[PDB]
């Protein structure tokens, strides 16, 4: 039996709680700045908020985070176990949506490496979630976890340019096992 | 003049997008409703502004872990008008105090004496709920059995007094189901009356000042209405008459509904007076809900969007007719209110920002004298809308006044906690215009126009407590048009200096 | 109320009082109007937070255990008021007698040594049935203004009950 | 081994957002027009609202929608997957029925090709919806999806003639994969 | 596969909707009439309400209805199919029950032909309804559905006599499939 | 495929309804009396209220009831099945326990003969009740059902002696089958 | 089938009712005294609240309880059975959490010997508590059950230190079988 732990990470507390060399930033102020103009950047390293680089992703707003800086290994002592790996990641986006609109977001990793977000209420990627998985077995130390929002550019009149103005924080529910 | 209906089903343009583990409640008590999302990962709320907008996600600073307990409930125990979290045990409650940004550290209040508290939900033959069956303004602990009604008085800070038996209620012990028991104040004297619902009739027990219940009286259901376990009785003020109405809902094969209206007027208010010398006054009241529905309907006729800042009904005086019984002469002074203001932070009614009078004489002809008069409410969303309702008319009048926030240091007023400075402006006059409604070409032109300017001096500063503030009218300008648009006779009286205690040191007429 | 140092008071006008700053007005007094009070009190000048009348309010509270707390109001027309010095003019908790909730006006002095004295009566179990006495047993807390004595028979600028000598044995 | 995405389609929003010369119309104001009179149409092409042409469906009000006109393929970049197939479609008719009332509606496509609506409150066809063979083969960018309300003519005195006049919207909950 | 249809049938609307040659009636006005009297009848033919004629059921109010008079086959066009047979039937009895009181009722058909109603609020006869059944496969045209209420006589001191005065309707939740 | 019936049985109404040749009593007053003193009984026969007789049992307040004197066979006619046997029994102790309190009570019969009541609010003796049991097949007419509360005498300072005076009634949710 | 019993154990009720020889204490007062300073102790024996002893556990508050002193064997008479083994233990922590905070706690016995508390409201350590377990079969009258709170030192800036100041109790939902 594994020690089955649920961890909640707020991306605003990660981005604003960055070291002053890499440059901390407000999440909701930089999302309002990145969406309103064409593109830009906010942050440094793997804890950043930039646009897309590839083809047909240049209108997508991508929020990257690093598992090594979330410091999940310090939440419990190392005498319990060192096999600390992800069971499941879900993500809640507290926003203000339209009358019949949805949220489009892709939770990626550097197949079970991607995850689509559709409503943002403890949103696993699955239709029904059955433990009988994406990101399962990724260690909680190394990696980079990107949340990409397609159609997120207001100069390019994207449909998600209005929902991201109402977005104040991004919440990840990391379920991981210690064994 | 007081007919209320509901509009079309309108699709709301924005919704707070987290529809799971949430409800609609005022978690902070500031008047506007919140969509409190207490899910597995986050806890917080979106507030609903009265101008249609939804606030973004505001996280609660502290939530108890026992908020998700199946037997905890939100009640008002500390007496501050907030919904605290309570777990009622038989001899010890656990109380988490609402402090308007989340909750505080939970206590364990042990009940004194032989007090063994009832448990809500733990019996199907009893109703254990929080109701004011004494009229005190506190949520007491009531237990409605089939035989008696026992009340434990809420003493604040989780404490509960010795139980009080309120006699007079009784049902058949077989045919008693507590789900048909409804504790609601019907007249407005303060204690909650007791309604028990049968099929084809409706027992109503009048609470006698929290000392017992009267003889019941039945209100038989009309032809085609019967009750069952799928039906529902709602009690609400859906009329704007000041008194609640009983709404019965039958959901099966089509939802159809009925409303019981018990009275027309709100009871126990002063109606008529008389000095037995030939003079009598009759007073008529209207709810502020009706003064909002008339204001909201006339705004949508000109394509404007009306916003209400008074979430609670204030039962106002509307018409006070005077009659001299000797000469037969009558005078009917009709009032009209608008721009009600309720402050969310101090949780207090700030008044109205626009009062009309209409002195119309009835001699046993002469035109009525309408007097518009604006007042400062203190709410900056209401005060900035008042000056768009004035009579402009002449295009040569001097510039209108604004309030003057001022700081007091070194014995003089030096200009400028902006909330307390606006709160001091409550009840200050801002304008008054007097008209005569004769149906002439000068009916819309005022007889005189008076404008005022309040100021507020801060006498000592307040860090966590309120400042000391002194509000006064610092300059008043009056006009005299005599229903002539051009050529008025204007004057002004300005105060320049005041000393430490508000006596004038330099005045200019 | 918690009945401690973390509580706020309402004035007679209904507005909240705050401590008046000069730092806070805190002085140590044992003598009011020449009369030895028997203890040393921590007088705290209060002030209305929305000033209309510009009167000041002193919260006298004893340091010694054995006396009780009271209020003074200095209205600007020369009057001084005494609010709730004796237990006949205090609405207090019937179990904890130090937990006062309402200091009722007891006496007034004008500038010309004219005095008014206010006499209150307590609630009692008189004329009520046994259903009243079972549910509300010791309801002897609520005060009613019974009679108001004025017409000061001799001039004095001291309060009629500071000296502790039967305030209506004066004429 | 897939990306499981939910998509909401409001049909009154779709019919109001048709281009000009394609006949944009209000679904609430053109249903009780077609119910009141005998026959008619609303829009053209596959995004039309009309009655059935064949026998036994002449008194059936059919609200059809095109799939390529929804442009679901633009909600995500093509870099995630060029295969986008429907998993499950559910219908919601908002605030139409009571707790003891019924709607009769058939959601078809041009076996597992049709679906009977009964309560219209996140209503699939089935008595229990288990993802444990619905809709293999159906792409999101081809075809048309119609919804037939039988007996919906008032001059023929059918049931649901009075009920369809009190209709606010028609909501389709399309679930699809990106493999 | 099959068009999984749910249909709500009110016995008070069937008994009021009888033709005048067949003697329509109000359900609760004849239930109270027959319970208080001990004997009597209502209606004609298969849509009747009376006490049972057999031995051991002389004091048992029985409410019968014909499937051919429910007109279920006109709810959908005949182009959809002809295999229209019942999957499941649940009973709702909107009465006034006590705090710990139960309804005794047998829903019959003329071990999967009978069903015992015990709480009367969306009541299927099973301890756990599992689609993975009584009245299954019964066609929606032939037969007669009878709800018998045991101990339903006030002259013979039945324990359900005062319960049945409060009963307003007999609501049937007929789930049937169109294959 | 049986008629699956649930009958709620209130034990105070049974004890109040014994004919006064056996001796009726109120359950709430006789529990307060028999807990406060050590000895004592109530009623007679099998529908009694007494203490335990065996070793380490004489401080257990036992409340027994006869299955024949419930007359559960009189709720349906014998023409629809003579074979009536219990599927499951659940116990409710209404208005007894607080939020984090427990009761110790054994519902037995004279390992499927006993059942431990722990929270007493529709309480089966199972950690996770699965219908696919104790008292499964006990006949409806025969036997006694005894609910024993250990540590229930107050002169021996029982831990359940204070909470048992609060007890108003004992409710049994008998679920049986008629086949 | 076993007598499946649940017992709710409150550690503040246990620690305040120790014999005076063993040094009882209040759990609520002693936590914010031990959290605010570096390390201390409370109680004696196995019913102690003290910081950890080993490597990388010194900044971790541990609340131990002894199974022998809860006296769960005397809740039921010894004729029902003499083995009483644990089925499952859940932990409830009456505390206050921040906006995105979790609870880090390890319930241990001196992989099925440990458990990880995450939300602290009827918190078994599992993602899905399937009864088809940790501490299963541990005898109720022997052993020591401890509850360790990592990062509990406020002079060493523990992230869990401000939650423990509000921790009023530690509730244990011991499910065990008597068979």
**How distant is the Cα of E178 from the closest Cα of chain D, in angstroms?**
9
Q: How far apart are CA C54 and CA E23, in angstroms?
A: 87
Looking at residue B222, the DSSP 8-state letter turns out to be: P
**Of D95, D98, D168, which has the smallest distance from its Cβ to B251's Cβ?**
D98
Helices then strands, each counted (H, E), chain A: 2, 9
CB contact under 8 A, B126 and F166: no
CB contact under 8 A, G99 and B66: no
Q: How far apart are CA B344 and CA E151, in angstroms?
A: 60
Contact in structure between G27 and F139 (CB atoms under 8 Å): no
Residues of B in contact with E97 (CB under 8 A): 177, 229
Phi/psi of residue A65, nearest 5 degrees = -145, 160
Concatenated DSSP letters of F5-70: EEEEEEHHHHHTSS-TTT----HHHHHHHHHHSS---EEETTEEEEE--STT-TT-EEEEEESTTT
**Of A94, A98, A103, which has the smallest distance from its Cβ to B42's Cβ?**
A94
In this structure, what token pair is assigned to residue G82? 């003499």
Closest CA to B11 of A102, D169, A166: D169
Nearest CA in chain C to B156: C1
Q: How far apart are CA F172 and CA C73, in angstroms?
A: 69
Q: How far apart are CA G108 and CA G93, in angstroms?
A: 16
Closest CA to G27 of G176, G171, G174, G177: G171
Helices then strands, each counted (H, E), chain C: 1, 11
Looking at residue B111, the DSSP 8-state letter turns out to be: P
Looking at residue B276, the DSSP 8-state letter turns out to be: S
Concatenated DSSP letters of B70-99: TT-EEE--SSSSS-EEEEE-SSEEEEE-B-
Which chains form contacts with chain B, at 3 or more CB pairs under 8 Å?
A, C, D, E, F, G
Cα B249 to Cα B111, B227, B233, B255, E102, distances in angstroms = 40, 9, 6, 7, 24
Q: How far apart are CA B306 and CA B292, in angstroms?
A: 9
Strands A61-66 and F171-178: unpaired
Substitution target in B427, B466, B471, B498 with the highest count of C β-carbons within 10 Å is B466
Q: How far apart are CA B478 and CA C167, in angstroms?
A: 54
Nearest CA in chain E to F171: E100
D vs E, Cβ pairs < 8 A, gives 54
**Of A4, A8, A78, which has the smallest distance from its Cβ to G116's Cβ?**
A4
A173 membership: H or E segment, kind and range: strand A171-178
Please, what is the Cα angle at E105 between E104 and E111, to 5 degrees?
Answer: 120
Contact in structure between B134 and B153 (CB atoms under 8 Å): yes
Q: Indicate the SS3 state at residue B209.
A: coil
B vs F, Cβ pairs < 8 A, gives 30
Contact in structure between A154 and A77 (CB atoms under 8 Å): no
Phi/psi of residue C45, nearest 5 degrees = -70, 120
Q: How far apart are CA B125 and CA B171, in angstroms?
A: 12
**Of C18, C76, C132, which has the smallest distance from its Cβ to B468's Cβ?**
C18
Q: Indicate the SS3 state at residue C126.
A: coil
Residue with tokens 């052993």: G143
**Of G56, G134, G150, which has the smallest distance from its Cβ to A75's Cβ?**
G150
Cα C93 to Cα B256, C101, G62, distances in angstroms = 53, 7, 44
In this structure, what token pair is assigned to residue G142? 């022997």
Concatenated DSSP letters of C16-61: BEEEPB--B-EEEEEEETTEEEEEEEEEEEEEESB-SS--EEEEE-
**How distant is the Cα of F1 from the closest Cα of chain B, in angstroms?**
30
Substitution target in F28, F96, F99 with the highest count of B β-carbons within 10 Å is F99
CB contact under 8 A, G4 and F150: no
Can you say whether residue G24 is alpha, beta or left, with left for phi > 0 and alpha for psi between -120 and 50 degrees? beta
Strands B448-460 and B404-409: parallel
Q: What share of chain C is helix, strand, coil (3-state, %, to 5)?
A: 5, 45, 50
Exposed, middle or buried: residue E114 (CB in 10 Å: 0-12, 13-18, 19+)? buried
Closest CA to F118 of G127, G17, G87, G147: G87
Q: How far apart are CA A156 and CA A59, in angstroms?
A: 7
Phi/psi of residue D37, nearest 5 degrees = -80, 175
In this structure, what token pair is assigned to residue A101? 């609109």
Q: How far apart are CA A125 and CA D3, in angstroms?
A: 7
In this structure, what token pair is assigned to residue B475? 């300059």
Substitution target in B12, B251, B257 with the highest count of D β-carbons within 10 Å is B251
Q: How far apart are CA E56 and CA F74, in angstroms?
A: 11
Please, what is the Cα angle at B497 between B495 and B498, to 5 degrees?
Answer: 100
Contact in structure between B497 and B472 (CB atoms under 8 Å): no
CB contact under 8 A, G127 and A10: no
Can you say whether residue B278 is alpha, beta or left, with left for phi > 0 and alpha for psi between -120 and 50 degrees? left
Closest CA to A17 of A61, A47, A52: A47
Contact in structure between G178 and G5 (CB atoms under 8 Å): yes
Residue with tokens 């059919």: D62
CB contact under 8 A, A79 and G102: no
Contact in structure between D27 and D11 (CB atoms under 8 Å): yes
In this structure, what token pair is assigned to residue C170? 């004066």
The distance in angstroms from the start CA to the end CA of chain B is 46
Residues of B in contact with F121 (CB under 8 A): 122
Contact in structure between C113 and C152 (CB atoms under 8 Å): yes
Contact in structure between B469 and B421 (CB atoms under 8 Å): yes
In this structure, what token pair is assigned to residue F87? 């599927």
Q: How far apart are CA B224 and CA B199, in angstroms?
A: 11
Phi/psi of residue B236, nearest 5 degrees = -155, 165
Contact in structure between B331 and B321 (CB atoms under 8 Å): yes
What CA dihedral angle connects C53, C54, C55 and C57, to 10 degrees? 120
Looking at residue B266, the DSSP 8-state letter turns out to be: P
Q: Return the number of other C-beta atoms located less than 10 Å from residue G28's C-beta.
A: 21
What CA dihedral angle connects F32, F36, F39 and F43, to 10 degrees? -10
B413 membership: H or E segment, kind and range: strand B412-415
Nearest CA in chain B to A6: B41
Contact in structure between B197 and B182 (CB atoms under 8 Å): yes
Residue with tokens 């089939």: B146
Q: Indicate the SS3 state at residue B257.
A: strand
B497 membership: H or E segment, kind and range: strand B491-498
Give the residue numbers in A contacting D (CB under 8 Å), as ranges: 54-57, 60, 99-102, 104, 106, 111-112, 114-116, 118-119, 125-128, 150-151
Q: How far apart are CA B106 and CA G96, in angstroms?
A: 8
B vs E, Cβ pairs < 8 A, gives 48
What CA dihedral angle connects B97, B99, B104 and B110, to 10 degrees? -20
CB contact under 8 A, D151 and E7: no
Looking at residue A74, the DSSP 8-state letter turns out to be: G
Contact in structure between D38 and A160 (CB atoms under 8 Å): no
Closest CA to G157 of G36, G30, G61: G36
Closest CA to G120 of G63, G50, G170, G160: G170
Q: Indicate the SS3 state at residue A71.
A: coil
Closest CA to F12 of F39, F30, F37, F34: F30
Phi/psi of residue A33, nearest 5 degrees = -85, -40
Q: How far apart are CA C51 and CA B458, in angstroms?
A: 10
Give the residue numbers in G contacting B (CB under 8 Å), as ranges: 92-100, 103, 119-121, 165-166, 168
**Of B177, B199, B252, which has the smallest distance from its Cβ to E98's Cβ?**
B177
Contact in structure between A41 and A53 (CB atoms under 8 Å): no
Residues of G in contact with B42 (CB under 8 A): 99-100
Is B199 touching E (CB cutoff 8 A)? yes
Contact in structure between B72 and B85 (CB atoms under 8 Å): yes
> How are strands ordered across the β-sheet holding E171-178?
E3-10, E171-178, E84-92
Q: How far apart are CA D60 and CA D153, in angstroms?
A: 7
**How distant is the Cα of D31 from the closest Cα of chain B, in angstroms?**
16
Residue with tokens 């909707």: E17
Q: How far apart are CA D117 and CA D98, in angstroms?
A: 15
Nearest CA in chain D to E130: D128
Q: How far apart are CA C26 and CA C42, in angstroms?
A: 7
Q: How far apart are CA B216 and CA B203, in angstroms?
A: 6
Mind spelling out the 3-state secondary structure of chain D?
A: CCCEEEEEEEHHHHHHCCCCCCCCCCHHHHHHHHHHCCCCCCCCCCCCEEECCCCCCCCCEEEEEECCCCCHHHCCCCCCCCCEEEEEEEEECCCCCCCCCCCCEEEEECCCCCCEECCCCCECCCCCCCCCCCCCCCECCCCEEEEEECCCCCCCCCCCHHHHCCCCCCEEEEEEEEC
Nearest CA in chain A to B11: A99
In this structure, what token pair is assigned to residue B261? 């209206």
Residues of A in contact with D4 (CB under 8 A): 116, 118, 125-127
**Of B9, B11, B253, which has the smallest distance from its Cβ to D100's Cβ?**
B253
Q: How far apart are CA E64 and CA E67, in angstroms?
A: 10
Q: How far apart are CA B85 and CA B76, in angstroms?
A: 8
Q: What number of residues does chain C have?
A: 171
G163 membership: H or E segment, kind and range: helix G161-164
Contact in structure between A3 and G106 (CB atoms under 8 Å): yes
Is B103 touching G (CB cutoff 8 A)? yes
CB contact under 8 A, A75 and G114: no
Q: Indicate the SS3 state at residue A11.
A: helix
Phi/psi of residue G74, nearest 5 degrees = -90, 5
Cα atoms in the Cβ-side hemisphere of radius 13 Å centred on F68: 4
Provide the sign of the torsion angle of the four alpha carbons B442, B355, B295, B243, taken in this order: negative
B vs C, Cβ pairs < 8 A, gives 41
**How distant is the Cα of B78 from the closest Cα of chain D, in angstroms?**
40
CB contact under 8 A, G150 and A76: yes
Can you say whether residue E162 is alpha, beta or left, with left for phi > 0 and alpha for psi between -120 and 50 degrees? alpha
Give the residue numbers in G contacting F (CB under 8 Å), as ranges: 1-8, 10, 74-80, 87-88, 92, 131, 171, 175, 178-179
Residues of E in contact with F171 (CB under 8 A): 100
In this structure, what token pair is assigned to residue B14? 């924005």
| Resolution stated for this PDB structure, in Å | 2.9
Q: How far apart are CA E73 and CA F138, in angstroms?
A: 45
What per-residue string of b and e applies to A70-83 under the rule 16 or more CB within 10 Å gives b? bebbebbbeebeee
In this structure, what token pair is assigned to residue D89? 């479609």
Closest CA to E99 of B198, B194, F28, F10: F10
Concatenated DSSP letters of A55-84: TT-TT-EEEEEETTTTTGGGSS-TTS-S-E
Residue with tokens 């009835």: B362
Mind spelling out the 3-state secondary structure of B278-294?
A: CEEEEEEEEEHHHHHHH
Q: Indicate the SS3 state at residue A15.
A: helix
Q: How far apart are CA D4 and CA C152, in angstroms?
A: 92
Contact in structure between E75 and E84 (CB atoms under 8 Å): no
Cα atoms in the Cβ-side hemisphere of radius 13 Å centred on B322: 12
Q: How far apart are CA B100 and CA D145, in angstroms?
A: 51
**How distant is the Cα of G75 from the closest Cα of chain A, in angstroms?**
31
Can you say whether residue C85 is alpha, beta or left, with left for phi > 0 and alpha for psi between -120 and 50 degrees? alpha
Q: What share of chain A is helix, strand, coil (3-state, %, to 5)?
A: 10, 30, 60
Residues 6 or more apart whose CB falls under 8 angstroms from that of E4 comprise: D116, D118, D125, D126, D127, E87, E175, E177
């Amino acid at each position: 039996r594994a020690l089955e732990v649920e961890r909640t990470v707020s991306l605003a507390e990660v981005y604003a709680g960055l070291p002053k060399d890499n440059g901390p930033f407000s999440l909701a102020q930089e999302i309002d700045k990145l969406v309103s103009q064409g593109s830009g950047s906010a942050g440094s390293g793997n804890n950043n908020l930039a646009f897309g680089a590839g083809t047909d992703t240049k209108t997508s707003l991508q929020a990257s985070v690093s598992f090594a800086d979330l410091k999940i290994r310090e939440d419990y002592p190392a005498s319990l176990g060192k096999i600390r790996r992800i069971k499941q990641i879900s993500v809640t986006l507290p926003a203000l949506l339209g009358p019949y609109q949805d949220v489009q977001a892709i939770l990626s990793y550097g197949g079970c490496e991607a995850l689509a977000v559709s409503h943002g209420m403890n949103d696993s990627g699955q239709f029904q979630l059955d433990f009988n998985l994406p990101f399962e077995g990724i260690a909680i130390d190394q990696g980079t976890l990107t949340l990409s929002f397609p159609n997120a550019s207001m100069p390019e009149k994207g449909k998600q340019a209005t929902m991201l103005k109402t977005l104040n924080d991004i919440i990840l529910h990391i379920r991981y096992t210690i064994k | 003049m007081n007919a209320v209906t509901w509009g079309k089903m309108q699709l709301l343009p924005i919704t707070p997008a987290v529809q799971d583990n949430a409800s609609l409640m005022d978690i902070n008590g500031d008047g506007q409703l919140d969509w409190v999302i207490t899910g597995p990962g986050l806890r917080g709320y979106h507030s609903q502004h009265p101008d249609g907008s939804w606030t973004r996600f505001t996280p609660l600073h502290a939530l108890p872990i026992e908020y998700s307990h199946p037997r905890a409930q939100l009640a008002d125990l500390m007496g501050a008008g907030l919904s605290d979290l309570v777990l009622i045990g038989p001899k010890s409650v656990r109380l988490y105090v609402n402090n308007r940004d989340g909750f505080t550290e939970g206590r364990d209040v042990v009940q004194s004496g032989d007090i063994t508290l009832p448990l809500p939900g733990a019996d199907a033959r009893k109703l254990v709920a929080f109701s004011d069956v004494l009229g005190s303004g506190q949520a007491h602990l009531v237990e409605v059995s089939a035989t008696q009604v026992t009340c434990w008085p809420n003493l604040g800070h989780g404490r509960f007094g010795q139980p009080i038996v309120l006699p007079g209620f009784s049902q058949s012990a077989a045919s008693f189901n507590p789900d048909r028991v409804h504790l609601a104040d019907l007249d407005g004297s303060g204690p909650a009356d007791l309604i028990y619902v049968h099929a084809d009739r409706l027992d109503i027990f009048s609470n006698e000042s929290g000392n017992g219940f009267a003889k019941p009286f039945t209100l038989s259901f009309p032809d085609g209405l019967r009750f069952d376990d799928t039906c529902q009785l709602q009690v609400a003020d859906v009329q704007g008459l000041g008194v609640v109405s009983l709404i019965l809902s039958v959901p099966h094969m089509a939802p159809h509904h009925w409303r019981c209206d018990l009275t027309n007027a709100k009871p126990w208010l002063l109606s008529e007076t008389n000095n037995n010398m030939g003079a009598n006054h009759t007073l008529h009241y209207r709810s502020s809900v009706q003064f909002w529905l008339d204001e909201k309907a006339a705004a949508l006729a000109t394509g404007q969007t009306p916003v209400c800042y008074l979430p609670f009904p204030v039962h106002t005086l509307w018409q006070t007719e005077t009659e001299d019984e000797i000469s037969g002469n009558k005078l009917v002074t009709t009032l009209r209110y608008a721009h009600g203001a309720w402050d969310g932070r101090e949780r207090e009614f700030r008044g109205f920002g626009y009062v009309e009078q209409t002195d119309s004489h009835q001699l046993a002809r002469t035109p009525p004298a309408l007097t518009k008069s604006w007042y400062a409410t203190g709410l900056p969303a209401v005060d900035n809308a008042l000056s768009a309702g004035y009579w402009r008319g002449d295009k040569q009048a001097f510039a209108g006044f604004t309030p003057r926030f001022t700081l007091w240091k070194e014995g003089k007023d030096v200009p400028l906690n902006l909330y307390w400075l606006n709160r001091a402006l409550k009840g200050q006059p801002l304008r008054s215009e007097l008209y005569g409604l004769d149906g002439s070409a000068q009916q819309q032109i005022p007889y005189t126009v008076t404008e005022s300017r309040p100021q507020v001096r801060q006498l000592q500063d307040g860090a966590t407590v309120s400042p000391v503030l002194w509000a006064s009218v610092v300059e008043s300008r009056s006009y005299h048009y005599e229903r002539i648009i051009s050529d008025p006779q204007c004057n002004q009286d300005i105060t320049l200096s005041s000393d430490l205690f508000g006596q004038p040191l330099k005045q200019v007429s | 109320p918690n009945y401690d140092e973390t509580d706020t008071f309402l004035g007679p006008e209904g507005e909240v009082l705050v401590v008046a700053l000069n730092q806070a007005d805190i002085r140590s007094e044992s003598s009011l109007q020449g009369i030895n009070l028997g203890a040393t009190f921590t007088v705290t000048c209060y002030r209305s937070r929305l000033e209309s009348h510009f009167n000041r309010l002193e919260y006298w509270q004893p340091q010694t255990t054995g006396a009780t707390d009271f209020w003074l109001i200095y209205s600007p027309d020369g009057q001084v008021h005494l609010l709730g010095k004796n237990p006949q003019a205090r609405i207090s908790n019937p179990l904890n007698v130090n937990q006062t909730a309402q200091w009722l006006l007891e006496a007034s002095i004008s500038s010309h040594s004219e005095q008014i004295y206010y006499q209150y009566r307590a609630e009692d179990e008189a004329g009520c049935e046994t259903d009243e006495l079972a549910a509300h047993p010791s309801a002897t807390v609520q005060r009613y203004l019974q009679t108001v004595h004025y017409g000061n028979l001799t001039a004095s600028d001291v309060f009629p009950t500071l000296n502790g000598d039967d305030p209506l044995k004066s004429g």
